[PDB]
Write a protein that binds this ligand. Structure first.
Ligand SMILES: [Mg+2]
Ligand SMILES: [Zn+2]
Ligand SMILES: [Zn+2]
Lengths: 1092, 93, 426, 293, 94
RNA sequence: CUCGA
DNA sequence: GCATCCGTGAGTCGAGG
DNA sequence: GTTGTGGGAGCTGTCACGGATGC
């Protein structure tokens, strides 16, 4: 009973027992609505009219109003910007990806210049730059790569009070801090890293009367600030006055926030100096401890210390606002030169275009999108990756805290996160607690505060009027729970109800005391987390791991929706934006492996091009396939084609495998996994991986490289797959080592070997003298050449300086599941494949059906994730189908929930939502009435177990084993990517040690702790060898190779080059270091074989 | 710090790449083909082709170090170049 | 802290929404806490490695007759097993022949003290033993094999080239990530920092006088030798009094007028190890430090053999501080090695120093520069025109020479081997 | 006492305190502060070069000012700037605000090259990257002997590449040594047989990080395995704290005779059954084995 | 031979600093943007630090192993292995 | 920067 | 007479771009 | 050769410790 809203969406029967009173909002709205505010689109106009005041202003309109008008110091001239308009887009998205461009639109504005003494008003339309644009999917394209702007967590402007304890006698010491929208701050009156500031030396009070302060008049407090914060200059009477007037009263310097001003006026008074008086009164009357406070003109404020992690005092700046702030920076940097040109030039001859240099705004936008920590390479292993990435909230970055100045209380789950930031989905590693994901139903508001929806309660009556509350508004109310008994008409059945109050604590209050109720369970969860069946049965560690590992599934050649899922797979796949969706209801007029054309009813034609075998940012294969047939009538929103990890419109991150839970000969020891070789023969876990090799011919000192099929002394047979250009041919199968693009690089004459010198002399060779710098395929890689793209400087192809030609070979490979690959269930139950057994010796059921995967029993109980077991049971139920016996009534176990679950055909699609859905009793009931197989044999008994035969000896295993169907994902951690060895390779020019990294054919690092270990063994010679002739001895290593090749003993080791380099660095530090003999001076460091 | 990615990517366009211990040690070994092709010629004309082609001396210095006139040196040069191109023409390719 | 409302559900019944919510607190807090604990354990292991890596075996036996007494049992009318024979008695080498009063010689000096030996000693009624440790070892440079005893891995007598120092650092650091009063206390000990809650101790035997006041504990000892009376400052009521005043008296809390011996703790808590150094002697500071450190690792299920902690503690006392230079060029108040101070001989008093400080004060400026505070080390080395003998194993690693340990020892690396005549014949 | 330590060092060392003031700065060889160009024609250089450039520019400006006999205040400003720039070049950030490049990154001064976990000492002297080494993910091999481990064919072929080339020239599969190299690189079927010969009784070291105690590095005899994964004997897992949830391990090939001997005798898995810290046994049945028995 | 006995430090006197040096750098210029060649008397000058290419001088009149150790007079760049570029220090006169 | 043990 | 202000520590090994 | 008006970005949620410095 789910997915009824989405047309054509398959029928996934749901065990849920609660009505869904609110659908999932646009799971990308967090990004879109933000950008649509920034731009001022009609969408945002209507959305603000529906839930906002009558005077809306977009991000750019606001920036312009703030900047206007650029005025001369004498007030003689004034420049005013207005009416931000966009042209159409320069190039489409796929075009920008192909050409390595930046999807953007030209920005235009009306610039009105006025000379106050000539009356001349020359209006003009000025162009501000190529403003980068947000795509349908909510991303950006910069330099041809797709990027996401992750929302940032930061402290909203305002004043905040806290209560510390002094090291004197544990006295309760109050402190305050004022965080501004822009400018400096202060504390208590210490200001700008200058302590020892009496609060009374700058202007019933308990200690305000005690201030100690010795002065009278206004010049003392005016001169003390210039003598205490503006040093390096004598004490003056005018400069201190000027600075004090330009500190906080001045609006140019000190930017009073809008959100900040709202928060502060809510903290002190409905309607600056008033604020400072209220703040002093607040600190005083907080040192006392009184409940409320009365300020002149303001009233009704609770005297209380503020929580720094509360979501009513912690906001997030969406993409729109980050862009707005970068634009403000560029605009101020431009206004500087605008005034600086107003000064010099003559009036009546300066047009808006003459004094407006946009270079700083362009550079600001560019630097933001290209260097900000919040513009991130889009995680697109699969649709769920990108969907969560867009909805993500991180606290690091410019303007937030530091990855090292962020302690542990920052990373703690605050009670105000309920329904706003999911508490499960967060990284396990260093970034833990710092990167969360937006809750499913959550929604950002104009001020950057995360609101969440609740059903209104009128006289213990759950209504259908929904209301969105922020953390503050919520705290001030009593929120019922979603799984609260309610009779029709919205009436709590129980005398009282469980609820949450402001203290972050729960209570059991009479029904007439409830204000709002949760819209649904799982309201606190994120999208990924909401997709773990039987979540409540899993510990938070393994559940966090399950979410994180769902975001790592690799798309498989053929995708299969989970036999048992939540209700979120469909909506997740759709919002993610990797499936094609019918924008307008019509009739399929044509369908091909290439495109899909629908004829709308009003005669309109719309066509959709299928992404076919597209490489993703992480090598996964984005490949769409249509799921409509010619003549099919499709409604608006219906899914037209499946994406990479989707099936009929549902997130299909893995496959349904026949699992047996039992230790099998140790091959699944200590988390290993055993797979049936079927999964290889039938490609059940096979995936496609597309890599992009690139190579350019550029200008060198000795000339210019040339991409040529003619490479020095290469066998005609080796080039057999190269075209005339020296580029491999499409569809060619390339093993590791083959050539991909031939290239020669001008070589100097001094480098020619003596052999080559004589060869070019005797045979009268030419003066080419090049080196083979051709692009070869790296180790552990192979595949068919999917594609070839090429860019020539000859043609009108734009490339960097000195780069003549540039070719890119796109190579695909089909990876079969293999030993070493990493699989995992949705319950944080990960493991590498220990062995892939022949189907014949796999344990099999009575009917010869061999299991597909053997999961070691010893791994389940201690991890506290029996969720996988419940899933196995329900999955077998769904794979066999069932029929609850209704004759003589409906059994009590199936009475509560089951409505259309009383029977189900084999391979039925069922969803068990989190915190609702399948109950243990109902699971057991279904397990009792399993349907039989072909021969009318019930294979899995009422415990969920079944006898199995040892496919090796033939004898049956003595005890029944739990067999079932489990959803297993192929996580993007594959041996093919991680195997790496090296005998000898490139070294670093600085340390002369082996390069690091597989991509560079590097060597393993023998770290300090490894040398400790080696010493503990007493393996002196092994440690020396590892550290001298394998790393740094520039002659020792070549000697070692020469000795191995000629069957001679390994020579004695020399001197690590890194030591010479250390000596050189010391010397450069003016330290005279010197190596000495037993009794001698400093030792110094620094043909016949060739002639032979 | 310039990265290993940057170092290797630079070597991808340089006159000499980041060489291996293997490459060095094998370079140190003798090229049997050309060594055999040289050992065929009379060690006088071959010593001349050495002092003239491998080392690049001027013909006057070759006459000096050979203790022979210039004409003999250059005639040995011509004859030896002809011979070795004969034996090393199919080898050069 | 703990939430006054518990998780009444089992993860089989499925947790209610709010139960799952509250449980995430613990889950995530624990994940982050392990993240930090691993780094702290790592830094402590690194400092141990540095302060101890120059400690290798060099002789088979120093022949010393010093050692430590280990309890092997306690008697109650049948004998209990000594609580931690596993870590302090087992795997030692017996210093003095242990014979049962009115019995045969059960175990000979210089034996392994394995399971059979301990069992025989216990059956014969041997309630205690005296063993040889590196604490009381007499060798000059490092430790002798016999003072160290069995090699925990090989089960035999440690070989003459072992790097027992690094193995001790590892044995002590590897279980670090199990410490959940904890790892902080282990560091407070190994670094020899005046403890947070300082529990003063009796400076000399005598009679005690307590004085009560409003949060004011005032103690005064009248010495039995008649010297001046030792007055200890007032202590807040937070420190309850120690629970042994039993010299033929009250085997209970300290009461005014009790007889206090010299090395008796006065009030519950931890005691300053420097105070015990100056009051009871260095061989007592070693015992106290080893036991205190072992306490933490024992309260967590971690059996670290005492000999490792002794290998570490040894390197904290190798130096003395010179009060009056006297006839020598040693500046006063400077930390000088004990042998460098004995040979030259000079008011040299023992001194305890933490592993970090002990390490930064080594004779190899290269080692110090590579360990920590590179800038200061290098500047002082340049000023003092220091010269590194290139003798520590870390130094040789840096320069690419065979480390002086295991197969790097001179006797081992220069072995000559020729086939015998009888074999050369056939 | 404090102010005496330094004066006495300067006295007894023969180091004239005059050194503490410099009239000439030393410039480190260019190879130790390299310069390269990346994809895009742009150039990358070591911070050093930029600090040296600032020092040299300000020095030339001071010379030009001294020649132009400018006001004493201007020349004093230039001298202060020169002192500050040399301080940056030496220990940037130590005094005043650090010198920043693009992005406000404090440039790595000459002192930064010696300090830290990633400085010269800890990062390049106490541990380095080595040849004849590899990495890959580990999976349990139950059929293994405690003294055995399974190496992927390709891994072993790459590690022993010189050995296999030598045995390929011994036999007449390859004409010369260059041809033996080309053959081993193409993976010609002749190599495989030869490979199993070279690997005979040739130990290899396996390591898993973090290396907490020495058992974190253990020696094994390798046997060729089908796949691209390292097979690890289960009993040793305890020693490595290794479970097969995806961790990987590194392989090192001892070359010298003494190295192979240390691997066979000192670090052989079979010889390291017991915990060097407690004497208890580690290579002991752990979970499944236990239940089985 | 890796058998040193001791290693010693000491503050360097300007005399030591100049004895070390192979020439003083004078200009901020590093390399010619066009020819990718080290500007002379700059932080990459080959006259003092060393030759970029084996046995090749700056101007080019000398490029062959025939004359090793020769000191070119046109541009004053020793003709030796470029390895020395890692071991030849410069200096600046304050 | 993110991620794996 | 010391109270602050600063300067030093804070796990290892792996992968992309 | 420079001749009308002129203070910038950066932390900025870390902690625990030991010893010059500085009033
Ligand atoms: Mg693991
Ligand atoms: Zn001894
Ligand atoms: Zn020249």
């Amino acid at each position: 009973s789910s997915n009824n809203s989405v047309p054509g969406a398959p029928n996934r029967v749901s065990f849920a027992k609660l009505r869904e009173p609110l659908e999932v909002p646009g799971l990308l709205d967090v990004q879109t609505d933000s950008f649509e505010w920034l731009i001022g689109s009609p969408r945002w106009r209507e959305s603000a009219a529906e839930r906002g005041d009558v005077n809306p202003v977009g991000g750019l309109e606001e920036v312009l109003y703030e900047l206007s008008p650029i005025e001369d110091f004498s007030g003689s001239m004034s420049l005013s910007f207005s009416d931000p308009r966009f042209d159409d887009v320069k190039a489409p998205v796929d075009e920008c990806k192909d050409k390595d461009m930046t999807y953007a639109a030209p920005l235009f504005v009306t610039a009105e210049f006025i000379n106050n003494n000539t009356g001349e008003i020359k209006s003009q339309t000025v162009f501000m730059g190529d403003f980068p644009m947000m795509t349908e999917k909510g991303t950006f394209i910069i330099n041809g790569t797709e990027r996401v702007v992750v929302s940032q967590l930061v402290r909203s402007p305002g004043v905040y009070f806290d209560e510390t304890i002094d090291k004197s006698t544990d006295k309760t010491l109050h402190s305050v801090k004022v965080i501004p929208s822009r400018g400096a701050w202060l504390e208590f009156v210490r200001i700008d890293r200058k302590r020892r500031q009496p609060v009374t030396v700058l202007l019933f009070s308990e200690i305000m009367r005690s201030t100690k302060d010795n002065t009278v008049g206004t010049d003392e407090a005016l001169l003390d600030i210039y003598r205490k914060l503006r040093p390096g200059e004598p004490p003056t009477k005018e400069s201190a006055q000027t600075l004090l007037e330009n500190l906080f009263f001045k609006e140019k310097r000190y930017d009073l926030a809008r959100v900040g001003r709202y928060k502060v006026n809510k903290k002190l008074g409905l309607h600056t100096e008033e604020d400072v008086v209220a703040t002093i009164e607040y600190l005083v009357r907080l040192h006392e401890g009184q409940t409320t406070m009365t300020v002149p003109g303001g009233v009704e404020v609770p005297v209380e210390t503020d929580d720094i992690d509360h979501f009513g005092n912690r906001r997030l700046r969406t993409v729109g606002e980050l862009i707005q702030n970068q634009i403000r920076v560029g605009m101020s940097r431009m206004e500087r030169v605008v005034r600086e040109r107003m000064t010099t030039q003559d009036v009546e001859a300066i047009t808006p275009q003459t004094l407006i240099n946009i270079r700083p705004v362009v550079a600001a936008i560019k630097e933001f999108f290209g260097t900000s920590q919040l513009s991130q390479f889009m995680d697109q292993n699969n649709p769920l990756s990108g969907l969560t990435h867009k909805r993500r909230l991180s606290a690091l970055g410019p303007g937030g805290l530091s990855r090292e100045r962020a302690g542990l209380e920052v990373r703690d789950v605050h009670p105000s996160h309920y329904g706003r930031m999911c508490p499960i989905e967060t990284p396990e590693g260093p970034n833990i607690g710092l990167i969360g994901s937006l809750s499913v139903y959550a929604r950002v508001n104009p001020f950057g505060f995360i609101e969440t929806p609740y059903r209104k309660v009128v006289d213990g009556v759950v209504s259908d009027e929904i209301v969105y509350l922020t953390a503050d508004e919520e705290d001030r109310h009593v929120v019922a729970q979603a799984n609260s008994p309610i009779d029709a008409d919205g009436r709590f059945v129980e005398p009282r109800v469980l609820v949450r109050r402001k203290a972050g604590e729960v209570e059991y209050v009479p029904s007439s005391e409830v204000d709002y109720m949760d819209v649904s369970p799982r309201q606190m969860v994120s999208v990924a987390t909401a997709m773990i069946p039987f979540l409540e049965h899993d510990d938070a560690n393994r559940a966090l791991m399950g979410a994180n590992m769902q975001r790592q599934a690799v798309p498989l050649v053929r995708s299969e929706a989970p036999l048992v899922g939540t209700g979120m797979e469909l909506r997740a796949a759709i919002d993610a934006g990797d499936v094609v969706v019918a924008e307008e209801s019509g009739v399929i007029e044509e369908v091909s492996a290439d495109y899909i054309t629908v004829m709308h009813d009003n005669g309109t034609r719309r066509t959709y091009r299928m992404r076919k075998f597209a490489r993703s940012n992480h090598g996964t294969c984005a490949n769409q396939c249509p799921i409509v047939d010619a003549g099919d009538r499709v409604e608006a929103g219906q899914v037209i084609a499946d994406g990479p990890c989707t099936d009929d419109g549902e997130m299909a991150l893995g496959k349904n495998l026949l699992v047996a839970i039992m230790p099998w000969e140790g091959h699944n020891y200590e988390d290993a996994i055993i797979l049936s070789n079927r999964l290889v023969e039938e490609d059940v876990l096979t995936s496609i991986h597309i890599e992009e090799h690139e190579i350019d011919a550029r200008d060198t000192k000795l000339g210019a490289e040339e991409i040529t099929r003619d490479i020095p002394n290469i066998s005609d047979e080796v080039l057999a797959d190269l075209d005339e250009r020296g580029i491999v041919r499409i569809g060619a199968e390339v093993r590791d080592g083959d050539i991909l693009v031939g290239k020669v690089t001008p070589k100097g004459e001094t480098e020619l070997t003596p052999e080559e010198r004589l060869l070019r002399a005797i045979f009268g060779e030419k003066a080419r003298e090049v080196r083979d710098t051709s692009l070869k395929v790296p180790h552990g890689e192979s595949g068919k050449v999917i594609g070839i793209r090429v860019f020539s400087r000859e043609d009108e192809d734009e490339l960097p300086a000195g780069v003549n030609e540039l070719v890119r070979v796109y190579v695909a490979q089909k990876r079969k599941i293999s030993d070493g690959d990493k699989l995992a269930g949705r319950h944080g139950n990960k493991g590498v494949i220990g062995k892939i057994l022949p189907v014949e010796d796999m344990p099999f059921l009575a009917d010869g059906t061999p299991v597909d995967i053997i999961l070691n029993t010893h791994g389940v109980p201690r991890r506290m994730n029996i969720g996988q077991i419940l899933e196995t049971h329900l999955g077998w139920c769904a794979h066999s189908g069932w029929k609850v016996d209704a004759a003589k009534g409906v059994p009590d176990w199936a009475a509560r929930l089951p409505d259309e679950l009383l029977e189900a055909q084999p391979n039925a699609i069922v969803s068990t939502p989190v915190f609702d859905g399948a109950q243990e009793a109902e699971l057991q009931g279904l397990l009792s009435c399993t349907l039989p197989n072909r021969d009318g044999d019930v294979l899995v008994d009422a415990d969920g177990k079944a006898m199995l035969f040892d496919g090796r000896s033939g004898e049956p295993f003595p005890y029944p084993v739990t067999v079932g169907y489990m959803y297993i994902m192929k996580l993007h951690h594959l041996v093919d990517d991680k195997i790496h060895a090296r005998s000898t390779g490139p070294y670093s020019m600085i340390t002369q040690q082996p390069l690091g990294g597989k991509a560079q054919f590097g060597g393993q690092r023998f770290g300090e702790m490894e040398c400790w270990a080696m010493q503990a063994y007493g393996a002196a010679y092994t440690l020396q060898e590892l550290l001298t002739i394998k790393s740094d001895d520039t002659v020792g290593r070549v000697k070692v190779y020469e000795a191995i090749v000629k069957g001679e003993n390994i020579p004695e080791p020399g001197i690590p080059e890194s030591f010479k380099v250390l000596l050189k660095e010391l010397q450069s530090l003016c330290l005279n270091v010197e190596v000495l003999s037993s009794d001698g001076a400093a030792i110094e460091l620094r043909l016949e074989r060739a002639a032979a | 710090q310039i990265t290993d990615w940057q170092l290797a990517s630079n070597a991808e366009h340089s006159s000499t790449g980041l060489r291996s211990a293997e490459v060095e040690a094998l370079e140190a070994l003798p090229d049997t083909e050309i060594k055999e092709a040289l050992q065929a010629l009379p060690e006088e004309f071959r010593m001349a082709v050495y002092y003239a082609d491998v080392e690049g001396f001027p013909y006057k210095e070759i006459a000096e170090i050979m203790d022979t006139p210039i004409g003999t040196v250059m005639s040995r040069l011509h004859r030896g170049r002809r011979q070795l191109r004969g034996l090393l023409a199919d080898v050069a390719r | 802290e703990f939430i006054p409302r518990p998780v009444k559900s089992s993860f089989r019944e499925g947790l209610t929404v709010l139960e799952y919510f509250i449980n995430t607190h613990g889950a995530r807090k624990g994940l982050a806490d392990t993240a930090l604990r691993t780094a702290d354990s790592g830094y402590l292991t690194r400092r141990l490695v540095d302060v101890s890596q120059d400690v290798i075996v060099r002789e088979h036996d120093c022949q010393t007759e010093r050692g430590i007494v280990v309890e092997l049992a306690e008697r109650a009318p049948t004998l209990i097993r000594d609580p931690y024979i596993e870590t302090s008695a087992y795997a030692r080498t017996l210093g003095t022949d242990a014979v049962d009063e009115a019995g045969n010689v059960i175990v000979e000096r210089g034996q392994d003290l394995g399971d059979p030996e301990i069992d025989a000693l216990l059956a014969a009624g041997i309630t205690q033993v005296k063993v040889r440790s590196v604490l009381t070892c007499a060798t000059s440079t490092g430790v002798c094999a016999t003072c160290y005893g069995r090699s925990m891995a090989t089960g035999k007598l440690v070989d003459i080239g072992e790097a027992v120092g690094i193995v001790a650092a590892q044995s002590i650091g590897e279980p670090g990530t199990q410490l959940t009063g904890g790892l902080p206390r282990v560091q407070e000990l190994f670094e020899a920092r005046v403890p947070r809650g300082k529990a003063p101790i009796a400076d000399v035997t005598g009679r005690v006088r307590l004085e009560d006041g409003e949060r004011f504990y005032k103690i005064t000892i009248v010495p039995d030798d008649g010297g001046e009376e030792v007055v200890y400052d007032k202590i807040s009521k937070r420190q309850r009094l120690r629970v042994f005043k039993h010299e033929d008296g009250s085997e209970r809390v300290l009461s005014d007028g009790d007889h206090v011996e010299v090395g008796q703790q006065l009030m519950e808590g931890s005691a300053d190890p420097h105070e015990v150094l100056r009051v009871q002697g260095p061989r007592e500071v070693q015992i106290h430090l080893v036991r205190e450190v072992q306490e933490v690792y024992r309260a967590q299920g971690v059996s670290i053999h005492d000999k490792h902690i002794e290998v570490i503690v040894r390197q904290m006392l190798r130096r003395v501080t010179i009060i009056d230079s006297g006839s020598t060029e040693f500046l006063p108040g400077s930390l000088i090695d004990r042998a460098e101070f004995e040979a030259e001989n000079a008011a040299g008093r023992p001194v305890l120093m933490g592993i970090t400080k002990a390490s930064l004060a080594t004779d190899s400026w290269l080692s110090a520069a590579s360990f920590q505070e590179t800038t200061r080390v290098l500047t002082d080395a340049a000023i003092n025109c220091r010269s590194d003998k290139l003798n520590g194993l870390k130094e040789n690693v840096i320069i690419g020479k065979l480390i002086p340990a295991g197969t790097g020892i001179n006797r081992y690396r220069n072995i000559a081997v020729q086939p015998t005549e009888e074999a050369r014949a056939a | 006492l404090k102010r005496l330590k330094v004066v006495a060092a300067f006295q007894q060392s023969g180091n004239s305190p005059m050194g503490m003031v410099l009239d000439a700065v030393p410039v480190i060889p260019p190879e130790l502060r390299p310069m390269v160009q990346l994809d895009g024609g742009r150039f990358a250089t070591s911070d050093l070069n930029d600090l040296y450039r600032r020092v040299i520019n300000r020095n030339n400006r001071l010379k030009r000012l001294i020649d132009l006999g400018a006001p004493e205040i201007i020349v004093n400003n230039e001298k202060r700037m020169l002192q500050e720039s040399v301080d940056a070049l030496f220990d940037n950030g130590r005094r005043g605000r650090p010198v920043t490049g693009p992005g406000n990154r404090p440039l790595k001064s000459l002192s930064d090259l010696l300090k830290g976990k990633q400085g010269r000492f800890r990062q390049n002297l106490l541990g380095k990257r080595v040849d004849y080494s590899g990495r890959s993910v580990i999976v349990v091999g139950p059929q293994l002997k405690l003294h055995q481990c399974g190496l992927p064919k390709l891994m072993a072929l790459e590690l022993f590449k010189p050995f296999v080339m030598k045995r390929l020239v011994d036999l007449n599969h390859a004409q010369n040594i260059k041809s033996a190299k080309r053959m081993v690189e193409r993976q010609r079927p002749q190599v495989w047989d030869v490979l199993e010969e070279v690997i005979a009784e040739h130990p290899v070291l396996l390591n898993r990080a973090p290396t907490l105690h020495r058992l974190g590095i253990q020696a094994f005899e390798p046997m060729l395995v089908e796949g691209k994964a390292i097979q690890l004997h289960p009993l040793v897992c305890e020693a490595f704290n290794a479970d097969f949830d995806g961790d990987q391990m590194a392989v090192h090939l001892p070359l010298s005779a003494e190295a192979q001997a240390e691997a066979r005798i000192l670090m052989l898995s079979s010889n390291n059954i017991l915990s060097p810290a407690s004497g208890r046994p580690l290579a002991m049945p752990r979970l499944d084995m236990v239940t089985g028995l | 031979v890796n058998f040193f006995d001791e290693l010693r430090i000491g503050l360097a006197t300007a005399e030591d600093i100049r004895q070390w040096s192979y020439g003083e750098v004078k200009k901020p210029e590093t390399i010619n943007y066009r020819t990718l060649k080290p500007e002379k008397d700059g932080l990459f000058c080959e006259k003092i630090f060393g030759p970029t290419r084996d046995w090749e001088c700056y101007c080019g009149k000398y490029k062959r192993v025939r004359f090793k150790g020769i000191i070119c007079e046109r541009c004053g760049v020793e003709v030796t292995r470029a390895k020395v570029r890692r071991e030849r220090m410069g200096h600046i006169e304050l």
